[PDB]
Amino acid sequence: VMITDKLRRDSEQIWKKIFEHPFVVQLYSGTLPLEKFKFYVLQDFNYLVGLTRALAVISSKAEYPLMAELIELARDEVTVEVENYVKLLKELDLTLEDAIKTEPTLVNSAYMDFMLATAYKGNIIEGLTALLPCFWSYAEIAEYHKDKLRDNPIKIYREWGKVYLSNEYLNLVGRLRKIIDSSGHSGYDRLRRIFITGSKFELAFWEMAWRGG
Amino acid sequence: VMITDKLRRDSEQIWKKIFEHPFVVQLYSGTLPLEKFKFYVLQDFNYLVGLTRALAVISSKAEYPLMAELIELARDEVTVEVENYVKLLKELDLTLEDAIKTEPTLVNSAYMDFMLATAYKGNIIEGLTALLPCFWSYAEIAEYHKDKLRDNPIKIYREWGKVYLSNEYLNLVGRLRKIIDSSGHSGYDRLRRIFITGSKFELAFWEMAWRGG
């Protein structure tokens, strides 16, 4: 049994809660009030930066060529993805400055600090595992609700969700999983706790997005 | 106006919430069910270790003699304080192993990762500021409730609370504040955000301790 499948198995109860979270459900169904979505999208700036910080630390510690592959990903987050994000902000009548000036919630800061902290104290696999719930759950969620997406009345939501269903996104999850699954068999327990914590943060992030605070 | 007094001022609404939190109030009054206290005390192990990790990082980056002073503090947490903690555990019919095997809540892990993460990306003053809510609020809380403490029927709670009223503890807070207050005038806003985040974590920690999860 591959490490990644084990992690998914041991965090099963939590992912079930992510899949059916009201924010997630309504976003994919199209019922989500645009304002709630805007609040979520503004909190995403901190998320994009945080993800980039943790990836920079992991790459700073990795062997070549992996460090090159990781740095490309970090670069894409604050480059290509920032452009897509600014483009999303436009559609919502918002600007990067609005995002930049948004105050991250405690959960937002906490989640990103958890990613950085794990990258700092842990080896390459531990750091990456702290980011897997993020990458993987976003793909699982869209797959889970794929049917509602086609029936979703809000063009902005359909465009947003289609990203996680794309082959490029899916290939990225595949790569991350592969790096982790091709590693040793020892220390699984540490990996399990890292993954679980990351999964709880995802659930908490969706919750704070819904509460608008 | 000194940096530290400013931080206290800008996080005033939060600290009011900490002072009157049910866990805090009942602990100091003596009405706290022993079980809730035991749950809290078991979560303290992760807190002691996390505090030590963050201090280690801050010292690794500081100039001598401050690095020496900070490492002594880190050393004391995992040595002298572990002994006092084990002694507290005894009084509660618990063992270090019980503490070591306790699973930290998401808030616990989050708080410690915030401390480490801030120590890692920030300069010496930013790292220390991430720890000030911790050190300072524990002293302010006991001062605030000092009157109930002498009227507290539970010996274990009185012993626990007396620590934060002692001259040794108070001197430590004084030192920490001094280091921070003798620093530049620039970057106050980053310090403010760090302090606020740390204060919200304190409130969250008391809340999770009360909820037992």
Add this chain to the structure above:
Amino acid sequence: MRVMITDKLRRDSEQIWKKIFEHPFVVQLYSGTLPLEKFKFYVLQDFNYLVGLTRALAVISSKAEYPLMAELIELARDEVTVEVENYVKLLKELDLTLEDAIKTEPTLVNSAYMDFMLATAYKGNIIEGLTALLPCFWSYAEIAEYHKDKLRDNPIKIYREWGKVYLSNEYLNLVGRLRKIIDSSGHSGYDRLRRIFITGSKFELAFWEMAWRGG
């Protein structure tokens, strides 16, 4: 009436930069007299440099505020992509492969210099981290400017291609930008910057020297 921080860094390291400008390896590389064998030893030692520069930039980036962080990760990214590609093309002209580079044992000097970069990025703020990298970026441009004439007249094509990179406007503008960042910082804490910059400058000299010694 106060000059800039980078003006002082150049000012305070003049003697060692002079030794760098006049180092046999450097002088011979730009004149075209360097024995092709010594250049290969140097190029080979460059892999570890390429990777090390990338590691340090990643750490500085991890601690920087946005948008500077993005500007820095882009530079780190280019070191290990665009530049690895160019490095491979250079290796080719010399009948060497990336494999040979990757397998090359870095001299003590090399390891040490890269460690100084990473260590400084880790313990200091971003200005201190970048200052640890300025001797690298800056001296390579100054060296080329210094031997500009000899280059435009160098018999060996590979050496010419190699050198021209540092005289380009893009490379010059990049170093300019790194200096702007350092110079727009606080007036205090100069002494720490000075020691960091001087250490980096010594490593640069040491690097040429070990490339000259072939060990």
Add this chain to the structure above:
Amino acid sequence: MRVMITDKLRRDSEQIWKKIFEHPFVVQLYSGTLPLEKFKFYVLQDFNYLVGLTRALAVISSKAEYPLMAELIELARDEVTVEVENYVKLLKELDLTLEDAIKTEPTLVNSAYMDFMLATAYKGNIIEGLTALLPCFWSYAEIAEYHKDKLRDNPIKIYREWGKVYLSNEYLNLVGRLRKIIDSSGHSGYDRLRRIFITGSKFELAFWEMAWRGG
């Protein structure tokens, strides 16, 4: 039938450790022939070493699991407390003050070695970090063991006091413990450990050399 990891590290660095055991500075310090002036230059350069060893231990401890983290922070704490006190007493016997030490400019070799320690602690796991510190702790004990006889017969009291520290059971037990931690780790990844240990060993030799050169 497989020897231990630290057995291999000693095995793979035999030639440079021999040069360390036979280095003039080392040989003369233990025989009692070293000119007191050279010892002072060395002791002076030790402050930066004392601080650097402490920084690297702090980073390793910050990443370690409990209780190893506590064992390591204690060692870091002793470096900057008990040992600074001993170092001050030594400085005194030599008519020097901590102030003189703190104000001493560390040679490039010194800075580099400390940076290698910190950089290794930062990028690698705890075993790799500790392995970067083993040549330090271990070689000092082996050197004393190696020149044991010369020491018990050294004319200069300060040198004798200085040397005896490394023959004590406590010091020997500490190195023993550091080796036990490294040896109870995984069988794989040895090559990384080897390069780290060999780098550290070269720095040790370089350190004596710069102490001998006085620059």
